[PDB]
């Protein structure tokens, strides 16, 4: 009972935002809380922000 | 209060160079250090690409023939193209590579003003002498990070993410310089790590300029 | 490229002449801290001012 089927493939680009569930491998499940500006991130002596 | 002044811009490399201020009063060392580091990492005029136009590719998830890399990660490479402008605020760069061989950034048909600083930054690997990539790369100014979506049109346009952040790693390290005869003049250094598109001296100049301008919110001139 | 929003002492709701509360208009993110911490270091660190030192 169907003549011709058209299938359309949307391809979104989802990235990190405050609320995406995200975990390490050792069952340390967490959720993103705030996309912290790179300056706010604590930096070590060399200045590489974690 | 002795004022700080630029005394060394030692160009340890083209990618990064430390900038040192000879005098700084007790306490102001870490103050100026943190202020400069924060204002540099946050806001510095960048030049990263904003819009590419492949020749025969419609959407960014297509795969041109001949290129050893799909278009998406070609864009991913492009968003870190270390380029700088001098006279314009937006420019469209044309690329026409042909024949087998990686497409180094030097292949970009640059002008006298827009000059790339990493002519070895590979974009894509052409794997056929009868295949030729052709890109109309649009390069703009700006500051901070601007994604593809939050910037308010034809099919061929591929809205790449924006990364207007010439600096990649800033780290100040106060020291102790025995200036004249007064001790406690903590010499300050800035082990900044740009992407080769901003002069470290001029970087510090503009960062201090914006710090003063925003600090002039509550003070007279 | 260099246009940055600047507040003008938007709220200066001083409670008593020995305790005020200055609240600026929105500033670009990463600048509220870079100004608050800078002024905090300046103020808790060094200003001209007389005080007792010994007796």
From TrEMBL, chain B:
Swiss-Prot/TrEMBL catalytic activity: RNA(n) + a ribonucleoside 5'-triphosphate = RNA(n+1) + diphosphate
EC number(s) recorded for this UniProt protein: 2.7.7.6
GO MF term list: DNA binding; DNA-directed RNA polymerase activity; protein dimerization activity
Presence of keyword Cell inner membrane: no
Keywords of this entry: DNA-directed RNA polymerase, Nucleotidyltransferase, Transcription, Transferase
A GO-annotated cellular component: DNA-directed RNA polymerase complex
Chain positions covered by the region annotation Alpha N-terminal domain (alpha-NTD): 1-221
Subunit structure: Homodimer. The RNAP catalytic core consists of 2 alpha, 1 beta, 1 beta' and 1 omega subunit. When a sigma factor is associated with the core the holoenzyme is formed, which can initiate transcription.
Domain notes per entry: The N-terminal domain is essential for RNAP assembly and basal transcription, whereas the C-terminal domain is involved in interaction with transcriptional regulators and with upstream promoter elements.
Protein name (record): DNA-directed RNA polymerase subunit alpha
Gene encoding the protein: rpoA
Full-sequence portion shown in this chain: 8 to 234 of 329
